[PDB]
Amino acid sequence: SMIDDDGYRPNVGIVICNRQGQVMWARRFGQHSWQFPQGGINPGESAEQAMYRELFEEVGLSRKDVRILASTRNWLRYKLPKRLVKPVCIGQKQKWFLLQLVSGDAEINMQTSSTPEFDGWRWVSYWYPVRQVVSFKRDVYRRVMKEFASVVMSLAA
């Protein structure tokens, strides 16, 4: 995606849950760091379209495999560590989506890109991601999981 004039890339994040309130947690390609799927928003792309493209590209799923349970209202922003930093990108502004997986686990394919975002995934408990994502994303993850919590835990009831 293209860096806005403040130095932020627009971007969508995806929280995928199951019926017992677990969420899909994926290992960044060739690292030991884990996160939710996140993708860029191409010009002309709506946030929802960008989310579905990211879903296909890195999770291998269709609209048919999921249902959208919620989404965040406005941009959530994080800045990149100065070290890990054309117009210079200093961070991301993100819109987040809560999906329920309704197809079998086997529909998930994280290996279709020539450069995967992820090596693979596993199910984890709902709150686990907050303490586990890399620290500069922790503020954002905490707000995302809190906004999505009332929806997911009602599913796990």
UniProtKB/Swiss-Prot annotation:
A motif (Nudix box) lies at residues 39-60. Magnesium or zinc. Manganese can be used to a lesser extent. GO terms for molecular function: hydrolase activity, acting on acid anhydrides, in phosphorus-containing anhydrides; magnesium ion binding; mRNA 5'-diphosphatase activity; RNA NAD-cap (NMN-forming) hydrolase activity. One of its GO terms (biological process) is RNA decapping. Optimum pH is 8.5-9.0. InterPro entries: Nudix_hydrolase (IPR020476), NUDIX_hydrolase-like_dom_sf (IPR015797), NUDIX_hydrolase_CS (IPR020084), NUDIX_hydrolase_dom (IPR000086), RppH (IPR022927). Keywords: Hydrolase, Magnesium, Manganese, tRNA processing, Zinc. Its EC number is 3.6.1.-. Residues 7-146 form the Nudix hydrolase domain. Gene3D superfamilies: Nucleoside Triphosphate Pyrophosphohydrolase (3.90.79.10). PROSITE patterns: NUDIX, NUDIX_BOX. Master regulator of 5'-end-dependent mRNA decay. Accelerates the degradation of transcripts by removing pyrophosphate from the 5'-end of triphosphorylated RNA, leading to a more labile monophosphorylated state that can stimulate subsequent ribonuclease cleavage. Preferentially hydrolyzes diadenosine penta-phosphate with ATP as one of the reaction products. Also able to hydrolyze diadenosine hexa- and tetra-phosphate. Has no activity on diadenosine tri-phosphate, ADP-ribose, NADH and UDP-glucose. Monomer. No interaction between this protein and catalytically inactive RNase PH was detected by immunoprecipitation. This is RNA pyrophosphohydrolase. It comes from Escherichia coli (strain K12).
